[PDB]
Every structure is written in C-alpha cells, then in structure tokens.
Amino acid sequence: MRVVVIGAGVIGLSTALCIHERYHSVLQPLDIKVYADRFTPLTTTDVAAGLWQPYLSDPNNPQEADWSQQTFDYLLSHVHSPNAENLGLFLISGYNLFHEAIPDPSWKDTVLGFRKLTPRELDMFPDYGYGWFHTSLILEGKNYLQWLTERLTERGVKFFQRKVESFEEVAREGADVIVNCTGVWAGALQRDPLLQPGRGQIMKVDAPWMKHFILTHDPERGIYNSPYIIPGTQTVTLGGIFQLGNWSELNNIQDHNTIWEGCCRLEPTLKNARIIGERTGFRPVRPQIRLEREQLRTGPSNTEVIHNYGHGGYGLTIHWGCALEAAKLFGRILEEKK
Template identity: 40%
Template sequence: MTSVKVVVVGAGVIGFSTAVCIAEALPSCSVTLLSEKFSPDTTSDGAAGIMFTGEFPDIPLERQRLWFKDSFDHLLAIAQSQHSPEAGVMLSSGWQIFKEAPADKFPFWSEFVIGFRLMTDRELRRFPDHTFGQAFTTIKCECASYLPWLENRFKRAGGQVQQRKVHNLQELGKSYDIIVNCSGLGSKQLVGDTQVYPVRGQVLKVEAPWLQHFIRDGDGKTYIYPGIHGATVGGTRQEGDWRLEVDEGDTKSILERCGRLEPSLSKAKVLSEWVGLRPSRRNLRLEREVVQLQGRQVPVIHNYGHGGWGVTLAWGTALDAMSLVRQCLSEKPARAKL
C-alpha cells in the first residue's frame, strides 16, 4: 500500500506539535514539514511559554478544556522525565495578581494546573496596587529548546523537513494528498484569512538567578517568568502592530513595570531583547475543508490563530488536527471506489 503524503506548513510550536502527532499516530502517512523559518527564528522561540490560557468566545468551553488538559498532561510528563532539561520543560510556581478581582476567580484551566488556590492577604501585601491573586504551579516550556527537541522526535518518527516558503496552496496540490496549515499569521497570505491579525509582543531576557517564582499581572501586559536560561520579562500587547524592531520606549516601560512588581530586577543584567507577532484571531481556527487544487479535491486541515496561547494549547490542538487527518484516511478508500 502506498503511503498517504501529508504536508504540514509551519515550523512553530503548532506546526511541529501537529507534525509529531501525525507521524507518530498514523504510520500509513509520509509526513513532510515545510517552512520558510525554523528555530530560533520562529514566533514561538520568543514565547514565555507559561501554561495557562484565555478563552475563545465562540468555541465550546468543553473543547477548550480538553485542549488545555491534553497539552498540560503532555508537557507535565516531559517535565517529570529525564528529557526535561534538553526539552526546556520545567515546573514553575508563582502568582497571577489583579488590581480588581476578575469575574471568574476560578478559570476553567484552574483544575488542571497544580495546587491552584486564591492568594492570602499576607501574600498580597507585597503587591500594594493589587487586591486579588491566584497562586499555582504550572509548566514553563522554553521553545528555543523545545522546538529542536520536537524536530528530532519528528525525524525519529520518519518525518521529513524542508526549508522553503509556500506562497499558496496550489503549489502543494500535485505533490501531497492532505495539507495541514499551521502557518499562523502567514495564513493571511496563504489562505486569504482576513480574520487573523498580529498582536506585537516585546520581551527581554534577563539574568536573575535569584528569582524562583513567576509573577503575572492579570491584564497580561506585565510579567516575570524565571526559566532555565534566564528570566523572561515583558511585555506588550499591541494589536495590529507589524513592527519587528525592538522599541526602546517599550524596553524602558517593561523594566519599570516589572521593577514595581519585583524591585530586585534593578540588579538583573539584560541578556537580550526580542519582538514577535502573535497570530491572533477572535477564535482559533481548527477545522477541515476540501479545496480544488491542480484539478484535484484536496483535504486541507487548518490549525492556527492561537494568539498568545500557542505553547499552552499546541499539543491539544495537534491531537485534534491529527484526528481530522485520520478521518480523511478512513474516507479515502471509499472515495477511490467511486
């Protein structure tokens, strides 16, 4: 039996997670991953990679819960294994603090992280501008290590990797039986999706080995995430902003805001500055369609638009995308008989 040729477009955390899931679960598929950019040049590489999430307004909550749970279980298994340091996956404890208590004090993901509880008055005392907080242990996944680790895992499962820019789906129509689109913000050009837009994020990597706990302001703009190779401090959430240059004004603002939450940061050495564009969308797109390419009907599975929650939801959405590929395979013989 000839293998079914599957192509995954995109080498960020969504693309590689999806490619690994397909290559490992569906041995009848020959999987190729195509991308113009690979680690360390993807948007995922600069992500803080801390596990919790927001909500997409029009996607059933049960589906979002499953994405989070599957991703958390997958990364927790790595964090508790011998692969933890090379994969860049570790447990991380800390606080999320709010100036005013949010409407949902126990978000849907709170039952999956470890030891979630509300902060005590004594804990909140060190953050005088904030009146409410949540304490929990979650996972930090550093993509600069995790992406190369996933790439090796993909190759061990028989996957092929090619560096090339894909301008449109037509150029893939003759060579592949199933296309999986994980091109993030690139979907604007690749499939003409006008609903996907950039949210610019700027972060700094600092050397502060004394910091052991993460701190995140509930507005999502100010955060300190200690990691394996320095702490990530940020950030910005600038919608519709395509600038990829470091903005010195943003750097100054980040250091000031983070310094108010953690005064000892004034002693930290700045190691690097980074800017990335989160591929945002009102609702993440995870669905299958059939597209006419080169005179053939080709199934296309879309998995993109995760915004700032790419690392958090990558494995759960990859499993879903893999299930859609499996569905295509089960329908294939029936179509061949017609």
C-alpha cells in the same frame, strides 16, 4: 500517501509528530515532509516563555478548554522523566495579580495547588489587592522545538526551507493532504481578516534568584498589556506589551521603558540585573483557533487542507490538544478515501 505540513513552529511540529504516531503502522504507509520559511531559533515559538496558562475567562469555544487540559496532563506526565530537560519542561509556581476580585478560573483544578493570595502575600505587591498562587509548567519553545525536530528526524521526516506562495502550488507538487500551521502569516496563503498580529516585545534578563512567575492583570490596559516576569532555565523573561495590527519586527525603545518601569515596580530587585537580550514576536490572534478541515476543490484535484492556526498568546499552552484534534481530522480524510 504523501502529506506536507507548512510551518515549523510548535503547531507544525507537534501536528506532524501526532499524525505519524497515529498513522505509521505497516498497513498504512505514510510519507511526510515539513515546509517552513523559518526554523528554530527564528520562529514566534522561540520568543514565547512557555508558561502554561489559558486566556483566563470562559472561552468562546469550549473545545479549547479541553485541549489546554490535554496539553497540561501530557506535559505533567513528563515533567519527572530524566529527558524533561531536553524539551525545556519544568515545574514553576507563581502569582497572578489583580486590582479587583475576579472569579476563579476554569483551569483552577487543572493546575497544581491553586489558591487565592493571603493579605500578607498581597502586601508584597502594592498596586494589586487580589490574586492567585498556583504551580504550573514552563515548556521553553527553544528546547521543545529542538526536541520535536530530533524526534521527527529519526522517524523519517524530511525538512525543507521554502516560502510557500499558495496551496495550489504545493498540491501540483504531489501532496495529498496539506497541513496549514503558518501561524500569524496564514493570511498570505488564504485571506483571513479574523487573523491579526498581536505584537509582543520581551526582555531576556539575567536574574537567577527569581524563582516564581508574576503575572499582572487589569481590564483597563487589556490582555497581555500588563507587566509579567517569567523565569526560564537560563534567563528571566520580562514582558507586558501587546499591540494589535502591528507588524513591526523591530524592538522599540518606548516598549522597553514600559516593560522595565513595570517589572521593577513588581520586583525592585530587577533594577540591578543585566539584560542578555530583547526580542519581538507576533501572536497569531484570532477570535477562535481555525482547526477545521477544508476541501480545496479550487486547484489541483479535490485536495484536502487541514487548517491549524490562530493560537494567539497561548500556543504552547494548547498545542497538544490541537495536534491530537488535527490527527483526528487526518483520520476522517483517510476513512473517506474510497
């Protein structure tokens, strides 16, 4: 009853945790190990600020919307436990700014105290004339990945460092079910033209007076290409860069100036704030999340493969709904045994 999960990001770790707590009981003996090329603090998850917020128009797959809601409710039911600081979970309020009047989002009632910005609040941001204010959650990837690792290590889950070159290679090794949580690199295991890197560059600035998140939006520049400021526990994330098809895991100077001159137009207080770090990541951009069960009859035996990747810029927002759905698929393989 052995199962291998490939990848140690928010997807691989929550999926591995979900499957356990759903199939661990005496009658069902379960063996699980995780294979990953990179672990915390070197994953994409470690680069993500952790703000809960879906993509903000009607999703192409209505499933996703419920998975986002499932994640929020799960996280909000945790936000006030003394252990919440170990997963880097806290409550944050903030602004979402626009140039034109857009309809209220689907997640309007998922979030806390959602409302439309007043003219006086809008007068604090002089390039934007419409907007929202609401209370969400930040789930810092660094702390959450440590929490999941701890949680998995005490429940008997072994961890291994290796770069998998094919599913057939891990199938001949022993594993019954393979859980594919490779993120942006899934293509190297099974070609996927739909999956593309959504290059992001961030700036980690020391600004503790910064108490709210500010997200800006314009259909002109596109998604994730507009200034954003996201306070964390130890620093403030300064972003607003999205380059599709870009595989450069190198910090670019032109992007630094774009983020800096954009965030300082929002919060001019940021001009006299020290920079602790700059980092780069690739959002696993896919039109839809691939959360489908696939029988790999092309290789060792009739091996089952659970695909779970392509969560773009909302991996931390959606992860739990996915992890539950993946566990549901694992149960379908189990009931269809013999």
